[PDB]
Design an enzyme around this catalytic site. Structure first.
Site, short mmCIF file in Angstrom:
data_model
loop_
_atom_site.label_atom_id
_atom_site.label_comp_id
_atom_site.label_asym_id
_atom_site.label_seq_id
_atom_site.Cartn_x
_atom_site.Cartn_y
_atom_site.Cartn_z
N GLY A 182 19.37 25.63 -73.20
CA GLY A 182 19.81 26.53 -72.18
C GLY A 182 19.83 27.92 -72.71
O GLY A 182 19.53 28.32 -73.79
N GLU A 183 20.29 28.73 -71.86
CA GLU A 183 20.11 30.29 -72.10
C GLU A 183 21.17 31.20 -71.61
O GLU A 183 22.14 30.62 -70.81
CB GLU A 183 18.89 31.07 -71.65
CG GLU A 183 18.33 32.21 -72.18
CD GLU A 183 16.93 32.97 -71.72
OE1 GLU A 183 16.54 32.67 -70.65
OE2 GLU A 183 16.41 33.82 -72.48
N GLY A 184 21.37 32.44 -72.14
CA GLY A 184 22.46 33.43 -71.50
C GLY A 184 21.83 34.61 -71.65
O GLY A 184 20.74 35.04 -71.70
N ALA A 185 22.86 35.77 -71.33
CA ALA A 185 22.41 37.16 -71.26
C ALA A 185 22.06 37.77 -72.44
O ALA A 185 21.26 38.80 -72.65
CB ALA A 185 23.73 37.91 -70.81
N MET A 198 20.34 32.15 -76.71
CA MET A 198 19.41 31.08 -76.24
C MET A 198 20.07 29.65 -76.91
O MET A 198 20.23 29.87 -78.36
CB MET A 198 18.30 31.05 -76.55
CG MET A 198 17.38 29.89 -76.60
SD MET A 198 15.32 29.91 -76.61
CE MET A 198 15.07 30.68 -75.00
N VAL A 199 20.28 28.53 -76.29
CA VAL A 199 20.72 27.31 -77.30
C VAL A 199 19.55 26.51 -77.19
O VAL A 199 18.92 25.96 -76.17
CB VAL A 199 21.94 26.81 -76.71
CG1 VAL A 199 22.29 25.57 -77.20
CG2 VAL A 199 23.25 27.75 -76.40
N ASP A 242 39.05 31.61 -70.63
CA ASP A 242 38.03 31.18 -70.05
C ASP A 242 37.78 29.66 -69.78
O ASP A 242 36.70 29.41 -70.01
CB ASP A 242 36.93 31.94 -70.51
CG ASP A 242 35.53 32.16 -69.36
OD1 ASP A 242 35.95 32.05 -67.92
OD2 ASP A 242 34.56 32.14 -69.54
N1 LIG Z 1 23.32 30.07 -73.44
N2 LIG Z 1 24.03 28.90 -73.65
N3 LIG Z 1 23.30 27.97 -73.08
C1 LIG Z 1 24.00 26.71 -72.28
C2 LIG Z 1 23.81 25.46 -72.57
O1 LIG Z 1 24.12 25.09 -74.01
C3 LIG Z 1 24.71 23.98 -73.67
N4 LIG Z 1 25.59 23.81 -75.18
C4 LIG Z 1 26.32 24.72 -75.90
BR1 LIG Z 1 26.87 26.24 -74.95
N5 LIG Z 1 26.78 24.35 -76.83
C5 LIG Z 1 26.26 23.12 -77.12
C6 LIG Z 1 26.45 22.10 -78.07
N6 LIG Z 1 27.35 22.29 -79.07
N7 LIG Z 1 25.50 21.00 -77.98
C7 LIG Z 1 24.54 20.55 -77.08
N8 LIG Z 1 24.51 21.51 -76.02
C8 LIG Z 1 25.25 22.77 -76.17
C9 LIG Z 1 25.39 24.17 -72.79
O2 LIG Z 1 26.05 22.80 -72.15
C10 LIG Z 1 24.50 24.58 -71.81
O3 LIG Z 1 23.75 23.76 -71.22
#
Ligand SMILES: [N-]=[N+]=NC[C@H]1O[C@@H](n2c(Br)nc3c(N)ncnc32)[C@H](O)[C@@H]1O
Length: 340
Positions: A21-24, A27-28, A138
């Site tokens: 996934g991503e953010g502002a 990125m994850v 939050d």
């Molecule tokens: N940017 N951010 N990305 C958001 C995505 O990362 C996922 N995510 C996060 Br934040 N921490 C996570 C973790 N420790 N393990 C798996 N997914 C995660 C979250 O559920 C979402 O889907």
């Protein structure tokens, strides 16, 4: 450096990356940890261009490094360049969690046992947070991670603060705490969100959302939120109004037509009555009458799980709560323990 979807510079320890996934400003991804032989989550953060981003990043790192609790996500490692000059990003490595409550609620109906278990875990983690004199500020489904065996971990402390009840009071329609749907009525009326009751409201909203898979107070915008809250709770009592000294806030409420309370069992006809009793106590209008985390843990709904001796508190509470360049230096310093 390895690339994803963007530099993801985490080797050689971490490999075989998969976008999540991503953010502002990050990125994850999932990644294989070559030392521990397990897959992990890695969050890339790039906050250094903006002061506010640096603030939230510092809060997250400082809090999570100090906390140690089964229902709070841990930081396992932090990856970054060896020098401030070369540091453009920070990667936070965490346990890999299968999903989060937001994603889960999109497609899955929860059993009453799951609702009970999840709520117990949320409150258990929250007890520890509050015992450290910290407010999460939050709480919402997307900040509750779940693994494949439904272990629940609270994440994202970027908006957290040290509790400050003596300085909570403010004026009408000024404050912006939490994410809209999970925001307590007082935030819109007279509160800066510096008391623990702010978090309990959000948990109540989460509980309601677990019962039906829809947000209980789906405000369409900031000003709409109070409409939804009052539309269900009904008009506040004279006693509860008397607790609001601010005239703009009190007079706004007095200007509204009378609204009846909508009974929880009409909204949630399939719900466990004990869940609804607890829900009512979390979603109490007056923040002073609102149930506290330790009371909630002891509520009959949670009796199968409740055990105060197995609900630990923080050893070392936080006692009290700068340009982006000092913030970068602080983040660099806070992350040094993980070098090389
Ligand atoms: N940017 N951010 N990305 C958001 C995505 O990362 C996922 N995510 C996060 Br934040 N921490 C996570 C973790 N420790 N393990 C798996 N997914 C995660 C979250 O559920 C979402 O889907």
């Amino acid at each position: 450096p390895e690339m994803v979807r963007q530099v993801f510079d985490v080797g050689p320890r971490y490999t075989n990356l998969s976008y999540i996934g991503e953010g502002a400003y990050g990125m994850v991804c999932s990644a294989y940890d070559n030392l521990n032989k397990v897959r992990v989550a890695i969050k890339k953060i790039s906050p250094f261009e903006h002061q506010t981003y640096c603030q939230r990043t510092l809060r997250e790192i400082k809090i999570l490094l100090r906390f140690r609790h089964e229902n709070i996500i841990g930081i396992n490692d932090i990856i970054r360049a060896p020098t401030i000059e070369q540091m453009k990003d920070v990667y936070i490595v965490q346990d890999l969690m299968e999903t989060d409550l937001y994603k889960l609620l999109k497609t899955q109906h929860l059993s009453n046992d799951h609702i009970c278990y999840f709520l117990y875990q949320i409150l258990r983690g929250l007890k520890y947070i509050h015992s450290a004199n910290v407010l999460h500020r939050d709480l919402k489904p997307s900040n509750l991670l779940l693994n494949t065996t439904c272990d629940l971990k609270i994440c994202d402390f970027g908006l957290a603060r040290v509790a400050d009840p003596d300085h909570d009071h403010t004026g009408f329609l000024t404050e912006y705490v939490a994410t809209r749907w999970y925001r307590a009525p007082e935030i819109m009326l007279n509160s800066k969100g510096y008391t623990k009751s702010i978090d309990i409201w959000s948990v109540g909203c989460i509980l309601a959302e677990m019962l039906s898979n829809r947000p209980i107070f789906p405000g369409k915008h900031y000003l709409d939120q109070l409409n939804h809250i009052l539309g269900i709770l009904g008009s506040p009592s004279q006693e509860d109004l008397n607790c609001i000294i601010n005239l703009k806030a009190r007079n706004y409420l007095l200007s509204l037509p009378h609204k009846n309370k909508v009974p929880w069992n009409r909204l949630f006809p399939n719900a466990d009555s004990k869940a609804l009793d607890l829900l009512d106590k979390m979603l109490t209008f007056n923040p002073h009458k609102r149930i506290e985390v330790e009371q909630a843990l002891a509520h009959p709904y949670l009796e199968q799980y409740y055990d105060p001796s197995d609900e630990p508190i923080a050893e070392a509470p936080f006692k009290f709560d700068l340009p982006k360049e000092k913030l970068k230096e602080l983040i660099f310093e806070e992350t040094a323990r993980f070098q090389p």
